[PDB]
Amino acid sequence: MSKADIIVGIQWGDEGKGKVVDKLCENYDFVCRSAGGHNAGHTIWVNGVRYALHLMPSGVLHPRCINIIGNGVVVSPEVLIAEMAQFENLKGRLYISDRAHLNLKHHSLIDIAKEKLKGKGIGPSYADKINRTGHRVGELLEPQRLCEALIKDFEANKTFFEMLEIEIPSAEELLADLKRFNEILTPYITDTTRMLWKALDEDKRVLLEGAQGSMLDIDHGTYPYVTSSSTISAGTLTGLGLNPKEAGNIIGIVKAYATRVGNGAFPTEDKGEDGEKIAQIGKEIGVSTGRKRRCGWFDAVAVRYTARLNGLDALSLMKLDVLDGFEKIKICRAYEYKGMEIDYIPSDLENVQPIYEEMDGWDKVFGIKDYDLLPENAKKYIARLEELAGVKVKYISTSPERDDTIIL
Amino acid sequence: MSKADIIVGIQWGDEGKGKVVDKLCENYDFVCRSAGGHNAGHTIWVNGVRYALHLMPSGVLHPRCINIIGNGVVVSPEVLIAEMAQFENLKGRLYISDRAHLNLKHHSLIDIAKEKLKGKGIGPSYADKINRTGHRVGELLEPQRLCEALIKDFEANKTFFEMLEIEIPSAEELLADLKRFNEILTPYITDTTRMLWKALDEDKRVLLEGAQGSMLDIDHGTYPYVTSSSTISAGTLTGLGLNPKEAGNIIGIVKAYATRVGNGAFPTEDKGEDGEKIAQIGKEIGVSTGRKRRCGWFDAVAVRYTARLNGLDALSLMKLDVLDGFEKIKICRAYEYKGMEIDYIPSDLENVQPIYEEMDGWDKVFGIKDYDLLPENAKKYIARLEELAGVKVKYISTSPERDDTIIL
Amino acid sequence: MSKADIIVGIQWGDEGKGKVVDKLCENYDFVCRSAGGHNAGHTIWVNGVRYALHLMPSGVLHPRCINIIGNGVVVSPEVLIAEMAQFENLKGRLYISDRAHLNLKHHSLIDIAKEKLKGKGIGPSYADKINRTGHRVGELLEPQRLCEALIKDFEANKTFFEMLEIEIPSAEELLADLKRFNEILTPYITDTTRMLWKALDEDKRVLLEGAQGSMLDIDHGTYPYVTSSSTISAGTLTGLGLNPKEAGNIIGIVKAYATRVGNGAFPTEDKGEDGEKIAQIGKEIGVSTGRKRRCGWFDAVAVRYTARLNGLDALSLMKLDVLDGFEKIKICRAYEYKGMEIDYIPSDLENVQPIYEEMDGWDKVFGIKDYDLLPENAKKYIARLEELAGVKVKYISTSPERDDTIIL
Amino acid sequence: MSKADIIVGIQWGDEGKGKVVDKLCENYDFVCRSAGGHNAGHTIWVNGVRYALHLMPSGVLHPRCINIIGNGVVVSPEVLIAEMAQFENLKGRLYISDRAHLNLKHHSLIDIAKEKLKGKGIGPSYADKINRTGHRVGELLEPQRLCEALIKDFEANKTFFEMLEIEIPSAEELLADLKRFNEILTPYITDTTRMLWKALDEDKRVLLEGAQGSMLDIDHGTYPYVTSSSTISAGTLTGLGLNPKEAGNIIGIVKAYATRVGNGAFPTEDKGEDGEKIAQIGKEIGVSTGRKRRCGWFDAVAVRYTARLNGLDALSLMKLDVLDGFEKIKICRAYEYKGMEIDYIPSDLENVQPIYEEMDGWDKVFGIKDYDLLPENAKKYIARLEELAGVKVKYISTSPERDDTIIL
Ligand SMILES: [Cl-]
Ligand SMILES: [Cl-]
Ligand SMILES: [Cl-]
Ligand SMILES: [Cl-]
Numbered sequence A, B, C, D: 001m002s003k004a005d006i007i008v009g010i011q012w013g014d015e016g017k018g019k020v021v022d023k024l025c026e027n028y029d030f031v032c033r034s035a036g037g038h039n040a041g042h043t044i045w046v047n048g049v050r051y052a053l054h055l056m057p058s059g060v061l062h063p064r065c066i067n068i069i070g071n072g073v074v075v076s077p078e079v080l081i082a083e084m085a086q087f088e089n090l091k092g093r094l095y096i097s098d099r100a101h102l103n104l105k106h107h108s109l110i111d112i113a114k115e116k117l118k119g120k121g122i123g124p125s126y127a128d129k130i131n132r133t134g135h136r137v138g139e140l141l142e143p144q145r146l147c148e149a150l151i152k153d154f155e156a157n158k159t160f161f162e163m164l165e166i167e168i169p170s171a172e173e174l175l176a177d178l179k180r181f182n183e184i185l186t187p188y189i190t191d192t193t194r195m196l197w198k199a200l201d202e203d204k205r206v207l208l209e210g211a212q213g214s215m216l217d218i219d220h221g222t223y224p225y226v227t228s229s230s231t232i233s234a235g236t237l238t239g240l241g242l243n244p245k246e247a248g249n250i251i252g253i254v255k256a257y258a259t260r261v262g263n264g265a266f267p268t269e270d271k272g273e274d275g276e277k278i279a280q281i282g283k284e285i286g287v288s289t290g291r292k293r294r295c296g297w298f299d300a301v302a303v304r305y306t307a308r309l310n311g312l313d314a315l316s317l318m319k320l321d322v323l324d325g326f327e328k329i330k331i332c333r334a335y336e337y338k339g340m341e342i343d344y345i346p347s348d349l350e351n352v353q354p355i356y357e358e359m360d361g362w363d364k365v366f367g368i369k370d371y372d373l374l375p376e377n378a379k380k381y382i383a384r385l386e387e388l389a390g391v392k393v394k395y396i397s398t399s400p401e402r403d404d405t406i407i408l
Helices: A017-025 A077-084 A105-117 A122-130 A137-141 A143-156 A158-164 A171-188 A192-201 A233-240 A273-281 A300-310 A376-389 B017-025 B077-084 B105-117 B122-130 B137-141 B143-156 B158-164 B171-188 B192-201 B233-240 B273-281 B300-310 B376-389 C017-025 C077-084 C105-117 C122-130 C137-141 C143-156 C158-164 C171-188 C192-201 C233-240 C273-281 C300-310 C376-389 D017-025 D077-084 D105-117 D122-130 D137-141 D143-156 D158-164 D171-188 D192-201 D233-240 D273-281 D300-310 D376-389
Strands: A004-009 A030-033 A042-046 A049-053 A066-069 A094-097 A206-209 A247-255 A258-260 A294-296 A314-318 A328-337 A340-342 A352-360 A393-397 A405-407 B004-009 B030-033 B042-046 B049-053 B066-069 B094-097 B206-209 B247-255 B258-260 B294-296 B314-318 B328-337 B340-342 B352-360 B393-397 B405-407 C004-009 C030-033 C042-046 C049-053 C066-069 C094-097 C206-209 C247-255 C258-260 C294-296 C314-318 C328-337 C340-342 C352-360 C393-397 C405-407 D004-009 D030-033 D042-046 D049-053 D066-069 D094-097 D206-209 D247-255 D258-260 D294-296 D314-318 D328-337 D340-342 D352-360 D393-397 D405-407
Touching: A004 A017, A004 A233, A017 A042, A017 A206, A017 A247, A017 A314, A017 A393, A030 A192, A066 A192, A077 A171, A094 A171, A094 A192, A105 A122, A105 A158, A137 A143, A137 A171, A143 A158, A143 A171, A171 C171, A192 A206, A192 A233, A206 A233, A233 A247, A247 A300, A273 A294, A300 A328, A300 A376, A314 A376, A328 A376, A352 A376, A376 A393, B004 B017, B004 B233, B017 B042, B017 B206, B017 B247, B017 B314, B017 B393, B030 B192, B066 B192, B077 B171, B094 B171, B094 B192, B105 B122, B105 B158, B137 B143, B137 B171, B143 B158, B143 B171, B171 D171, B192 B206, B192 B233, B206 B233, B233 B247, B247 B300, B273 B294, B300 B328, B300 B376, B314 B376, B328 B376, B352 B376, B376 B393, C004 C017, C004 C233, C017 C042, C017 C206, C017 C247, C017 C314, C017 C393, C030 C192, C066 C192, C077 C171, C094 C171, C094 C192, C105 C122, C105 C158, C137 C143, C137 C171, C143 C158, C143 C171, C192 C206, C192 C233, C206 C233, C233 C247, C247 C300, C273 C294, C300 C328, C300 C376, C314 C376, C328 C376, C352 C376, C376 C393, D004 D017, D004 D233, D017 D042, D017 D206, D017 D247, D017 D314, D017 D393, D030 D192, D066 D192, D077 D171, D094 D171, D094 D192, D105 D122, D105 D158, D137 D143, D137 D171, D143 D158, D143 D171, D192 D206, D192 D233, D206 D233, D233 D247, D247 D300, D273 D294, D300 D328, D300 D376, D314 D376, D328 D376, D352 D376, D376 D393
Parallel strands: A004 A206, A004 A247, A030 A066, A030 A206, A066 A094, A247 A314, A314 A393, B004 B206, B004 B247, B030 B066, B030 B206, B066 B094, B247 B314, B314 B393, C004 C206, C004 C247, C030 C066, C030 C206, C066 C094, C247 C314, C314 C393, D004 D206, D004 D247, D030 D066, D030 D206, D066 D094, D247 D314, D314 D393
Antiparallel strands: A042 A049, A258 A294, A328 A340, A328 A352, A393 A405, B042 B049, B258 B294, B328 B340, B328 B352, B393 B405, C042 C049, C258 C294, C328 C340, C328 C352, C393 C405, D042 D049, D258 D294, D328 D340, D328 D352, D393 D405
16 A cells, blocks of 8 residues: 655644645655645745745645645635735646535625624534535536525525624625636646545655644544644545555654643643743744734643654654753643543643653754754753653754754 | 816715726826725726725726825735736836835734724824824835834834733844835835826826715714725825815715715614615625625715815716615705704714605616606706705716716 | 727738727727737837737727637637736636637747748648638637647648658647646637627627738738738628628728838838838837838828728828928829829739829927817828828827827 | 855757756755856746746746856846746745846847848847947846946947848837836846855855756867857856855766757767657657757767766766667767777867767666666666766666656
8 A cells, every 4th residue: 555644733733834844845746735724734934935825735835746635625715716826837736626615705704793793714614514505616617506506505594694694695796706716726626536546556655734733633632722623644534535554654743842822721831931931932923913822831741642643653843942041941741630640631631730840951952953962951851752752753943944953 | 287186985985986986097197096094995896807996096907097006095015915916017007105104014913902902004004104103105115224113113112012912023024024015016116296296297187086985084074983084185185295276177976875884973874674675786785794784865964065075076976776666765955953954064963863855766767878768756866966965966877887877 | 780890900000000999999898809810919018018919909908898809810829828918817808719710839830840941820820720620719628639639630741740840749748738728718718709799789889900901901912912811891890700780980090101011012112211211200110120111101092992992981190290390291192004094003013103292291290189280281181191092081190199199 | 165066968958957957956955057048948847837947047946945047147138037927926036146148139139130141139148248248137227227328339339230230229118128127127136146155155055057068068069069158067167156166066967868959060860760769759859840859879978078078976867768679779989080999079070980889778668766677788788878988877767757767
């Protein structure tokens, strides 16, 4: 069986995949996205230019790569077309599953009204997927048919629209948008299951880019604050129509400390000066809001958990430099839970307290390209993570520069 | 003195300028925007394609036109660059005032945090204009200088940023965005006052597109629900550096009934079935929210007021067909205010009640291209508006089709 | 019967249509090209930008216009795609006849080899049209089928390829180009006869742009130096599938003097200083070679001939200023042919000698916008042309500026 | 001293660099072009799309790469802008030497007239370089100044223009083109010597792409049929302002047989069926003319010569499969010259006759990825080339597929 490698962020997201996935792409013929909406992915700076890949697989920055958006992705044609515009010609380089669900204008309108009543459109688009009332990319090949079906849907749903105080979308406008999507996307729409199976049959090199944090997995992450989809490696197989025998090497991507964007259990969070420092140095700041992210110490219990959920062959450790010059650093080696010490991630994480090992910091790992040259305390910290995680660290990034990486 | 014609919406906006301004552009060498941010303008459908002109003057759809964004406009480079992308080449067709104020990323972030604490960035950008702490388009010609100045500004303001819980913007990111704006916008940035004066000196044909509803004028509109800027015709002169002797023909654009998007005094609002019908037939629905706009009967007191504020030579009456098949239609000829009948717009409009004339409806004006062929009741309604407004109606639009228009 | 207006150059080309057609377009819903390859049309400068319309109708500079490339045109997909790239979005604005003949790469290769043996590809593409072995635009909707058919054609023709010493085109390359043409052109390809008939049925305004000089007409022009196609007005009807009852107003475009680009009979040619002056002032210089065109005095015999061939309602007289400051100007009022004076264009034009009237020049018509203000000698010259041509002059252009035009 | 690697074609061109350079680029930070005009480079197919890099370095297909067009290149702004259009955004990825010579419209016109009198514009642009009358890229930063200087040049040269029968270029047109070049190219124009020196100082990875066949070198190639510039490795250093100490690894690219496009000495040419077969299988066919290239057996004397001229560390052997199924293959191991056997390339190559070794062919090397799996006769042929060339073969390409390559 010819196999696909897999790469996933094993935290709450922002593990810094981009530097990693981007370097790796050169070695693959196919780069594939599996699940999630456009809440996934990342932005990446290349030679001073900002690239958004929320929908598109990272391989689109490597013209040799063929990039597949799989059955599992929830695709907004608007967001996709806007991302495509960052490139001159993607034909032959980008294929979109005819089975991927559409997140259309009306999903955004529904989403907005719902927030009032208390990545737009993703939730309602997923809902329509699960209720099997939504429509899929292949239907864009028949805009007039799709438009008529949608109009029928809205009618049948009119009380839902009234309850949200939004009018039934215009048929004229809808047809015009659908025709536009048809004209633009037709050359990219294909059966991606057939194509990906063919690639593996021909022994081509295939990378699956898991697009979201393992701790955000709908089943295994810290529920309710999680995404709507499976984020772990077997989920990546599923969204692409691949089977467990087709899983190759699997690399987890992990920061040397932890962050969360929103609310939800965060055992190792540091609300004092250490955390604040991490936030500044690590630049963990929402691009859209300018808000500082929540920051905390490396959580080895959470990481061991997601390592096992993903079946990691290797860890790629990021932003180690962000800890330069800390006198002491913490690792959470276990939890205090309901009066006991536990080694695992319980379903109610809000009830655990971190149990820390303290370790001696270092002056600088920043920029270092050679393992031996690392501050001895940094070597100890790395070895301690590896040990607690249960997975070898094969990659260390000592700075934002693509060039500064240590290989083990 | 060689003169510039002017066109303004004389209601609360959405008067339907686009059909009007677009037809007129063919006859002008220069089309100019004066004030406001990107909350102004409109979108227009051409041969099935949706065009956003919020920032850009409508003349950009007529390659013969030179389009000026004046000193008075508050320009977001991001929004402007995105609008420009709808066109292949605007060089020589589009010029941006080096004196126009910049609405940058940080204004959006400020704007968002401010909403929490209770067209992004427009308010804070205007505030920086009035406090004379903001920066202007010409400064983009020196990105490094502008970047340094902005960094200094943020530092001096750091407590304001702390109070909003948003971090000081990255210097690296800022320089990169400013350099990008510089590289892209350099060919369009010029002294627009010198250029427009030259055009009039050479007896070129000039149209000023007022971009916002007269009833939304900051001074004369229904305060607090108004925009931040002057919307009436003399304001249009001011934003472009033009003097009262340079005002030509001035056309007001008015719907055959009235709408408001948000809250605020609306004397002629109809919250019953008539209003609902108007909303549906007139398609008065927020493009972004799908929410029905507030609708009401033509207000002749408000229209006489804005006609005089603008110094209208002529009215262009829009969406007359939206009243097809009403048995009876209303016109508000006066108000009941503090126990009296009044003929004017008082500063506190929330205290007036409409005094209506009722008039007999008609079956169809829809599609009619000849004045004589109009239902006699429609002729009476038109004559009655003209009389109450104090301005001749020179244009009647009987449907969305560019072709269906009556000239008087 | 609802009708299409027509505009044609009535000389040997370069009559200066662009200023004329461009001004007129604003008044039409449809602008149509009829016959010829990409040897037709012109380039036009707008606000300092150079636009090539060889294939595309001039109406593409007026987003309100719908532009039709008719059955009669010989379309090179490469040249067409390159012209389209001057615009951001033409969808809904540009339609290409599914019956138009394709001028493909191999026609260019054939064309080149044929020149050796003694607008590339046009001749061989026309030949394939007349022999009914060529393929048409609609076939691009099935690239694989078209590719297979072409391969079969080449095989059957292999001795022709051997005789030209060019190899049989690659099937792989051909499929790739055809697929590309398919992906790009699909949204523009339609039945243009049905569409144009519908437009006239709906009483839409239609302009047919004749793309080549009447004296270059294959039947009526100076043979052998002529184009391969009919250039006169009834030919314009034919290429679009229109009937004689559908012909509206017909405007001929004529320069105040005459030019020819290549060899061939040119009765009024002036090979001395007068001609040289005309060439310089009129800027009659090949854009691609920098070669001076042949120039000569107005030929009233040729113009009366093409006026009658076209059925002109009106003349539009161009570049009158180019004669400013001539002490004397000539008009050829008749010919000396085989010992007689003749009033007509004989089939062998190389055998005629011009018979001139001499007339008094003027100082300047340049820039003049008012008929009355014209130098009296210029009025006399204009009246004399009109008289000899048999058609009223309704348009006079006194300079390159769009604004400088006199209407009669 | 930090060093730049170099890659050159060591034949008459078409050695098949693209597959090679493209694979290598992923490993470099900078990819640089040194000399030549747009007669150099190649086209490359990526995932079914045709890319022209005549001017641009091959690294532009790898967004991580920074691409430098060096002092030595003769740059046509038109050709460069057209090549750039194949990409959406090159800012930060492409820099053009402010010292590179300009090949402008008038050079093309001169070039055309000169052919009459018996990659347009290249020759006359080079001539202007050598006579020190030409202008360079940096001058585009002052279009008005450059335009004035050029006008002065043309005047001083007017008899040259008269002798060529082409008019003095329009000042208006020239300014408009120069302004356009200025607006478009400003963000890419820099001092490339300073930039490249900085890169090496910072120990960045640098590849120099030699753009033309070593046997076409102006000094060392088969004169008069050669290009105008130095094509060998030290020439590549010179065009970029690099010194001999900065030369790294140098890879020669060589086909398993030989081709020439035009006339000129070609010792190993085969004008019979063997050569014809090579031409068909190797697809050696002019893309623009469809003409079969001249083909011949591998010339070991020529290859040893260019290996030494370039200082090759390694050979990369291409199109070995094109010889599949030949019963016998030839290698030219020496020449008969003026009655003697010689081992070197004499200045008059038209006077040598090939002295062949004959060797046993093989069935298929096509597609083979493993050295050991090669037909034993193929191993012998490879070993024999290496031996005669004096350079190890480190790369073997067994087919067009990027994937089919053997590494030694
Ligand atoms: Cl691209
Ligand atoms: Cl455009
Ligand atoms: Cl456009
Ligand atoms: Cl790109």
